[PDB]
Each structure stands twice: as structure tokens, then as C-alpha cells.
């Protein structure tokens, strides 16, 4: 049981992590667009706060 938990736990954990990481690599390429969108979101939030 102990070995099964270890195996499943690690798998689960890294699966969760990888899932989290794999999502990231695709993400580096999209970074400039992300910065632009974040800049746009900040600008829009400021405008919304003024309104």
C-alpha cells in the first residue's frame, strides 16, 4: 500500500505540476501578447474605475 500511494501520489503530484508546466511552455511564446493584454486590461480597469 505504501508503495502504491507513493507511486500514485507522485504521479498525481507531477501530473498536476506537469499539467501546470506543459501549459507554461506554450506560454513563453505568447508572452509579448500577454504583456500587451495585461497592459490593456490595466488600462481598461483604470478607465472603468474613472467611469
Amino acid at each position: 500500500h505504501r508503495t502504491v500511494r507513493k507511486i500514485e501520489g507522485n504521479l498525481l503530484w507531477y501530473q498536476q505540476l506537469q499539467h501546470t508546466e506543459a501549459q507554461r511552455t506554450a506560454e513563453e511564446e505568447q508572452q509579448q501578447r500577454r504583456k500587451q493584454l495585461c497592459k490593456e486590461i490595466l488600462e481598461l480597469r483604470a478607465e472603468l474605475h474613472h467611469l
Binding site: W13, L17, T20, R45
Partner: protein, 172 residues
Amino acid sequence: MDEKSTKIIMWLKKMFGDKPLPPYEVNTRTMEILYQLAEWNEARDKDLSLVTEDLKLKSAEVKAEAKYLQDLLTEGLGPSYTNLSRMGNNYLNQIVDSCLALELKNSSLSSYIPAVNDLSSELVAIELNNQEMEAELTSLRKKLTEALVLEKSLERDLKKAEEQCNFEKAKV
């Protein structure tokens, strides 16, 4: 400790009524937790009693005013104001239900407009706050995972390093 203990026992007796108090481990920590809980419950019970009594009073006052307005309208407009068309009644119910949903003081636009704006603003504000908190949770989880991996790697490297040092010590 003896006073806090008495308060807890009295409070537990009140909460469990006619049921024998279940045996539990009486240590400094269990007593502190129970004591905080007892203080919190007592303070909330007091607040809820005051709110409940007030709502009863308000229910009476609203009832009295409703009767007044009904009588005023019957005498002034006749019984015919209550004989609205099916669509008229639907429109009336929707206004009433909308006002109740926003907990408004009255059906005026001065009350409805700010209420709708506040509801919309609060919903956006909380949704943004939840997104920000989700990012923070994910970020911290990553940091925590990296740190845990590091901890295991360091434990391994340290063991190897200790073996290597022992081997070299033997050679020396």
C-alpha cells in the same frame, strides 16, 4: 483556569440540554478552543436575538403602513385600482419582485439605480479578487513544490556527500 472551565461546562450543558455531556480530553488546548467557541457563540446569540426582535417589530410596522396605504388608495382611487389587467398585474409584480430582490427602501428610480450599479460593481470586484487569489494560490503552490523538490534533492546529495567523505576519510 478554573473560571474558564466553569464557563465552558455551563455553556456545554446549555447547548447539549438533557443529553449527557460527551467525555472529551481536557487539556489546555481543547479548553482554549472551547472557550473561544463559547465566547463567540454567546456574543452571536445575543446579536441574533436583538435582530430577531427588531424584525418582529418591523414586520408589525410594515403591516400597519400597508393597511394605511391600502385604505388611502381605496378611499381615493376606489376599488378599481385593484382590478388591473393580467399584464398590468404582471408589470406590478415584476417591479415589486425586483425591488424585493435588491432590498430597496422604495420603488423610486433613485433607489433602483444605485442598487443595480452596486450589485454589478460588487460582482465584478469580487470576481477579479477571486482571479487574483487563484493566481496567488497557483504561484505559491509552484513555489512550495519547487521547494519540496529541492528539499529531497538536498537530502540525497547530502547522503552521497557524507558517504563520499567517509570513503575518503578511510583512504586518508
